[PDB]
Structure formats: structure tokens, C-alpha cells
């Protein structure tokens, strides 16, 4: 740790953290997406209803 270790350690930690945070974004939007798609599959059109 001549701070080369510190920047590589923070780089690996930030890679893990950025993967998990993009995962949280993708997971919440996928919940949004497939809830919307289920609602579309169970929603008949306007003229029909």
C-alpha cells in the first residue's frame, strides 16, 4: 500500500458496487417491465371491453 493498492482496492470495490447498483436498477425496471407486460396480457382492448 503505496496507495497503488488503495486505488486498485477501491477500483475492485467500485466494480463490485457498480455491478450491484446496475443490478438494482435492472431488477427494479424488470419488475416494472414484466408487471406491465402481464397487465397488458390481461388487459383486453378498449373497443372489446
Amino acid at each position: 500500500d503505496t496507495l497503488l493498492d488503495k486505488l486498485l482496492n477501491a477500483d475492485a470495490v467500485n466494480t463490485v458496487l457498480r455491478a450491484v447498483k446496475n443490478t438494482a436498477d435492472a431488477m427494479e425496471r424488470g419488475l416494472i417491465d414484466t408487471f406491465l407486460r402481464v397487465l397488458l396480457r390481461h388487459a383486453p382492448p378498449c373497443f372489446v371491453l
Binding site: 503505496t2 496507495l3 488503495k6 486505488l7 477501491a10 467500485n14
Partner: peptide
């Protein structure tokens, strides 16, 4: 000092809005 400034500015003073 130069080394801690490599960690401070050349990583980014804010860990948000970017990461150098």
C-alpha cells in the same frame, strides 16, 4: 501529499457524479 492528492483528486473528490 502528492500520493494522497492522487487518491483525492485523481480518483475524484466526489465518489458520486463520476469516478476517476
Amino acid at each position: 501529499e502528492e500520493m494522497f492528492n492522487n487518491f483525492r483528486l485523481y480518483y475524484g473528490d466526489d465518489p458520486e457524479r463520476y469516478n476517476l
